[PDB]
């Protein structure tokens, strides 16, 4: 639609603007029950081929049941939290005696009933497989009437189709300990996930968003085990509970802005250590530094609120004036001057440094730009390949408008003979304070003689 | 059971105490063999529906066999090692000529026989699928008697059931190059894994531990390809070999203990860069900084000792006295003062900083705490939700006892105008040495005039 961007040459930072987002401000627990069956014995003294097939399938189902019984740069400056606390909470509140029979009694007639539970928390509890009502009288009475013989052959294939879900549950849970992400489609069928999304206490706008975009909801949930005994086998599929809706979440990319000097390796360098997402919520912004935890599906930006910092809104004025005395922008200091490129949402930021050959090549024309020294930006329209040194990046071909804010780099605002190049993480105010301290150092060393 | 915890307000660090653990001090290699079959030709000039089905299945099996033939903060300060050296070692010692013929000769009668091999290493080598004994005379004589026609119809479904294991082996290995993790259930059936754990040269206590907890053993092993030829397709599953048993592994969480000052962003702030697990083994402690590599299944702490450091026992006295001159505690220095919360095993550590509203809300009462400035701890009993700024963490609901020791933050023990805040990793002795050096500079610069 209107995914624009701006490129600021002050720090050679890209800001892609217009990315109406959806955070993950809450969790929501929902207790899937699979109605299991208990079999006393499957003796079958007689032997036929189809009876051998159904015996092997029942043995695999029993082994699955026994299995389930046995199955009971600004990244450091963040907040770490376990992401499965709600599911463990409802599992612990299930594990007390008496709640299982309440679940089974409340799910006898209705398919998608709601259980009040002992804790006062409402959990949606609903069967999805109902294997008990199948095994009840379809296979056990047949197995024990004609001296363990099946008249038809389609029954074992029907049992295969019904038992595939439970066997995949067994495999997917046993591979991933007890907590697995993402939730698979045989873990929760998509019609049932749509019905569960529609039936849980959320905004109708969030219903529209999370029914149009069930892929990210599926890719963001967490399914944890619960009680298995009393043939009730249950697991909690903790689902995301999205908070703010359609909020402009601008994305910030940065590339190393070094000096233009070529002599040896004596170069000063500011790299803005602030890359990631900035979503607007409440009176603040959520900052997501982990670009691997925020999904970019369509033009909506789903994210993980638990893996975010909070910042005041003045960080928006960080985008315009890097020396603005309202918010302290975070930059990092470095002396290495390697050529590096980061491809933004539409264009590409390049910094070709020392002696390297970079070009912006289009597959229908050839090289068109041939970047010189310094940070530079190449728009989406015109190019489809960016080569920096001997590495090739493909630039995103997503349509939109680009703006180029002209200016001079902040390298020219610093004095190289006194500039500090140790800080892995710092700020503009801290760097300027150290510059002032070292300038007073120079002046007091001058006046001491 | 008795998972206790302590909160130290000196560095606002949580230590959860009592986590009887299990390291991974060794590997153990085991040679799974799938008995393959060689088919000269499957011509079948006549055609039928079921014969077409069995022909497509045999073609899929042949393609799978051909593909198998073609298939032949303290994180930097660690020790990096390849995790699959034992499986590669036994694969290399198998690759020499004549070994797999010995495997077949020793595995003809017994289903779990042991071979001595040429290297002197004893490897448990055994069959799990025995497809050669099935294809021997169940399908090939039938295919070549009634002009390529099958009288029955369940034989192809039985062949599907038997070939599902080999086809899933092909898929799971071709997806993950040659080395996959975790080992899947169709890669090694759990009855076979329990019998293999029972038969391998380990403590009986460790047998009980890895039979009750086959989940994490399944989630820590590594399966590697081996020789494919001579219809004796083999692969080595390298199983963890747990060392110490039920040793206390106290967990250390830290949160940024920044200063209480509010003027601009001139804050002096200490973050203990020591988070992770602490197990006791031999006369030392093993330190796991990677909290993503240690599983916390039940109250047992399985870990990966290849990603651990060794420390003397005096690091335990790092917990009580941060200025103790027996072990040098590791701290990091920072000026940024964002609000951050980590959630310990039972409670939550919060630090609400600058102008940031945080609360500890219970779902049945509402907000109960409303943290002020400074580090603070909120127990499990009373809350189930911790909001810091605009982010919402769920706190673990695991039962246990909490202690809250009283004291003053160590930032108040430091001088604001002389503190060094550029150390990504440092120690108490190093920081105090730099403080002493800078104070000596201050006194010599005062005395120079």
């Amino acid at each position, epitope marked *: 639609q209107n995914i624009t961007e701006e490129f600021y040459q002050s720090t050679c930072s890209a800001v892609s603007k217009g990315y*109406l987002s959806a955070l993950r*401000t*809450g969790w*929501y627990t929902s207790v899937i029950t699979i109605e299991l069956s208990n079999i006393k014995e499957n003796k079958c003294n007689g032997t036929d081929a189809k009876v051998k097939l159904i015996k092997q399938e029942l043995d695999k189902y029993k082994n699955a049941v026994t299995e389930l019984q046995l199955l009971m740069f600004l990244g450091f400056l963040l907040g770490v939290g376990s992401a499965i606390a709600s599911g463990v909470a409802v599992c612990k509140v299930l594990h007390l005696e008496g709640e299982v029979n309440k679940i089974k009694s409340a799910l006898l007639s209705t398919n998608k009933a*709601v259980v009040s539970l002992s804790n006062g928390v*409402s959990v949606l509890t609903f069967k999805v497989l109902d294997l008990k009502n199948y095994i009840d009288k379809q296979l056990l009475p047949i197995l024990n009437k004609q001296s363990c013989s099946i008249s038809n052959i389609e029954t074992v294939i029907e049992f295969q189709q019904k038992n595939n879900r439970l066997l995949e549950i067994t495999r997917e849970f046993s591979v991933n300990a007890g907590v697995t992400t993402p939730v698979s489609t045989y873990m929760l069928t998509n019609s049932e996930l749509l019905s569960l999304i529609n*039936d*849980m*206490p*959320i*905004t*109708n*706008d*969030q219903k*529209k*968003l999370m029914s149009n975009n069930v892929q990210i909801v599926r890719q963001q949930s967490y399914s944890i085990m619960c009680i298995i005994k009393e043939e009730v086998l249950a697991y909690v599929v903790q689902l995301p*509970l*999205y*908070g*703010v*809706i*359609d*909020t*402009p979440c601008w994305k910030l990319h940065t590339s190393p802005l070094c000096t233009t000097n070529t002599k040896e390796g004596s170069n000063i360098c500011l790299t803005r250590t602030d890359r990631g997402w900035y979503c*607007d*919520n*409440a*009176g603040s912004v959520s900052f997501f530094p982990q670009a691997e935890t925020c999904k970019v599906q369509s033009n909506r930006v789903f994210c993980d609120t638990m893996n975010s910092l909070t910042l005041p*809104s003045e960080v928006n004025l960080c985008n315009v004036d890097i020396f603005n005395p309202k918010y302290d922008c975070k930059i990092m200091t470095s002396k290495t001057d390697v050529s590096s490129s980061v491809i933004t949402s539409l264009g590409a930021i390049v910094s070709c440094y020392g002696k390297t050959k970079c070009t912006a090549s289009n597959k229908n024309r050839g090289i068109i730009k041939t970047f010189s020294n310094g940070c530079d930006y190449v728009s989406n329209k015109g190019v489809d390949t960016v080569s920096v040194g001997n590495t090739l990046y493909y630039v995103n071909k997503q349509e939109g408008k680009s703006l180029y804010v002209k200016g001079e780099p902040i390298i020219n605002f610093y004095d190289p003979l006194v500039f500090p190049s140790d800080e892995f993480d710092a700020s503009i105010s801290q760097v300027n304070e150290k510059i002032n301290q070292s300038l007073a150092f120079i002046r007091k060393s001058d006046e001491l003689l | 059971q008795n998972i206790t915890e302590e909160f130290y307000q000196s560095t606002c660090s949580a230590v959860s105490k009592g986590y009887l653990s299990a390291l991974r001090t060794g590997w153990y290699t085991s040679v799974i063999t799938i008995e393959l079959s060689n088919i000269k030709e499957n011509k079948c000039n006549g055609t039928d529906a079921k014969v077409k089905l069995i022909k497509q299945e045999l073609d899929k099996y042949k393609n799978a066999v051909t593909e198998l033939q073609l298939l032949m903060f303290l994180g930097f300060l660690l020790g990096v090692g390849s995790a699959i050296a034992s499986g590669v070692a036994v694969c290399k010692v198998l690759h020499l000529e004549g070994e797999v013929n010995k495997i077949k000769s020793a595995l003809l009668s017994t289903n779990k026989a042991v071979v001595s091999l040429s290297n002197g290493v004893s490897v448990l080598t055994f069959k799990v699928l025995d497809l050669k004994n099935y294809i021997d005379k169940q399908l090939l004589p039938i295919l070549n008697k009634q002009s390529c026609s099958i009288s029955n119809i369940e034989t192809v479904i039985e062949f599907q059931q038997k070939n599902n294991r080999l086809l899933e082996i092909t898929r799971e290995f071709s997806v993950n190059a040659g080395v996959t993790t975790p080992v899947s259930t169709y890669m090694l059936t759990n009855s076979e894994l329990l019998s293999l754990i029972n038969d391998m040269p380990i403590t009986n206590d460790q047998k009980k531990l890895m039979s009750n907890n086959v989940q994490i053993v399944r989630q820590q092993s590594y399966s590697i390809m081996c020789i494919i030829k001579e219809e004796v397709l083999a692969y080595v599953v390298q199983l963890p070999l747990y060392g110490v048993i039920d040793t206390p592994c106290w967990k250390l969480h830290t949160s940024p203990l920044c200063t209480t000052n509010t003027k601009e962003g001139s804050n002096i702030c200490l973050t203990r860069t020591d988070r992770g697990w602490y197990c006791d083994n031999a006369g030392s402690v093993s330190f796991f900084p990677q909290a993503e590599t240690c599983k916390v299944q039940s109250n047992r702490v399985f870990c990966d000792t290849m990603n651990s450091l060794t420390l003397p026992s005096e690091v335990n006295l790092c917990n009580v006295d941060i200025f103790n001159p027996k072990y040098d505690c590791k701290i990091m220095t920072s000026k940024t003062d964002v609000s951050s919360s980590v959630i310990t095993s039972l409670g939550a550590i919060v630090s609400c900083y600058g102008k940031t509203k945080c609360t500890a*809300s219970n779902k049945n*009462r*509402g*907000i109960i705490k409303t943290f002020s400035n400074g580090c603070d701890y909120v127990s499990n009993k009373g809350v189930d939700t911790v*909001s810091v700024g605009n982010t*919402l963490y769920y706190v673990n609901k695991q039962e246990g006892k909490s202690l809250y020791v009283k004291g003053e933050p160590i930032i108040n023990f430091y001088d604001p105008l002389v503190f060094p805040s550029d150390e990504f990793d440092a120690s108490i002795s190093q920081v105090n040495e730099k403080i002493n050096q800078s104070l000596a500079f201050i006194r010599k610069s005062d005395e120079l005039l």
Partner: antibody
Amino acid sequence: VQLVESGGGLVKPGESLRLSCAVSGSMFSSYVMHWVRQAPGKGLDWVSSITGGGNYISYADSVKGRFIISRDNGRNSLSLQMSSLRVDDTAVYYCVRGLSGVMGVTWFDSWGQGTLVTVSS
Amino acid sequence: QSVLTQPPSVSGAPGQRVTISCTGSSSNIGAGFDVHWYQHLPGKAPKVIIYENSHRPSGVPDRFFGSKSGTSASLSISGLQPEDEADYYCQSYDRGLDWVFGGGTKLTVL
């Protein structure tokens, strides 16, 4: 944070008009906004909603499709196109700016002054 | 006409506790949803006294105490004071008519 709007008066039934809201907030980009109404006699009701960018329009069941809600993010304003009119729509209308919930729901925070729209005769 | 039902004939003298109670259907309130209460003195705009059934905004005294249970919400006022005569409300999030509003209770002193 106070909301001020204008556009009221007497309007004959049937014809359309525009009712504008001139919120002077500082972060009118994330807050979920609504319009509510109240008539003398019967209780207060709900009219319309809008969430952020403007891709999640939601309406009441009493009036659907007839009212058009839009907002100018750059100019910091709301607007309702009042297409078609019946007798029941004579009411005092309130802009209402509310924050996102701990789950997703809005509790209708600080309200506007309230503009009277009369449609009788 | 609204799905929210409360009797709009509740009044009491200043001094004692008066409880306003409003109940909803199964689709609203009891299906895991929330109930918020607003106040409507004539003149100035309505403002929220209580949201999420427990919390309070910045300027709200200790007179107001709200609660919800099942499909019924209540709001108790302890020790009435004379200028509290207004229209107290309940709101909910019925999945049909989205942000449904109660009929309102006219609370007056005697």
